[PDB]
Structure formats: structure tokens, C-alpha cells
Amino acid sequence: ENTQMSEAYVERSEECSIDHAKAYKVHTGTVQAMVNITYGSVSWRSADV
Amino acid sequence: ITSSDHTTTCTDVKQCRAYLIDNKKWVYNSGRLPRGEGDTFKGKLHVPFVPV
Ligand SMILES: *[C@@H]1O[C@H](CO)[C@@H](O)[C@H](O)[C@H]1NC(C)=O
């Protein structure tokens, strides 16, 4: 006449803070580059474009 | 629930079950221990060796 009620559930492990995978949806974005330019007697200059 | 020595009617130990209630210290809610009655949650214990 005795009864044992068993319970169990899933939760994130401790490693999940450091060892996890990020699922991203990717859409067409932007394109950037760093260009190095020199002309005449002007020394090399660069900037993000 | 008796707080002092009690003499029961029964004559044979096998006829009775005695459960010790001593809550001075708490225990981890291990899946290998029978749960107590009511809100048995008493506190939190930090995990010492966390992943880093
Ligand atoms: C641009 O070119 C010159 C070539 O001597 C170099 O010294 C300079 O570091 C370059 N710029 C960058 C951002 O690397």
C-alpha cells in the first residue's frame, strides 16, 4: 500500500555558461574594408571605409 | 509524534516503525532521500568548483 512519487526535469548545466552554441539567422548585411592610400609625397594613410 | 520516551501498546518491535525527526541540519535534496512534508526548501548551497 506504499507509494513512491518520482519527479525529474531538465535544466541548463553549469557548463552552459561557457560551453554553448549560438544559433544565428543570417541576412545580407554590409561590407567594410580598411584601405591604405598614399599619393604624391603624402605618406601612407588609412581609415575604415 | 513523541518528544519523550513513550511506551506503546504493541509488544513486538516489528509491529512499529520509528522515524527520527531532527531538523537542526539540512540536507541536499538528493534523489536518494525521501522528501519531507510541506515546503522543505530551506536554503541555497553554492557550487564550489564551477566550470571556467
Ligand atoms: C600602409 O602601408 C605602409 C607601407 O610601408 C605601412 O607602413 C602601414 O602600416 C600601412 N598601413 C596599415 C594600416 O597597415
- Nearest Cα neighbor of B51 from A21, A13, A10, A22 is A13
Distance of residue B42 Cα from the nearest chain A Cα, in angstroms: 19
Q: How far apart are CA B13 and CA B17, in angstroms?
A: 8
B51 contacts A18? CB cut-off 8 A? yes
Closest-approach residue (CA) in chain A for B47: A14
With CB atoms and an 8 Å threshold, state whether A15 touches B52: no
Name A27's Cβ contacts closer than 8 Å, sequence gap at least 6.
none
Q: How were these coordinates obtained?
A: cryo-EM
Decide if B27 contacts B33 (C-beta within 8 A): yes
Radius of gyration of chain B from its Cα atoms, rounded to whole angstroms = 18
Distance CA A7, CA B34 (A): 12
B52, A17 in Cβ contact below 8 A? Answer: no
Of all residues in chain B, the one with the smallest CA distance to A13 is B51
Query: How far out from the chain centre does Cα B3 lie?
Result: 15
Resolution, rounded to a tenth of an Å?
Answer: 3.9
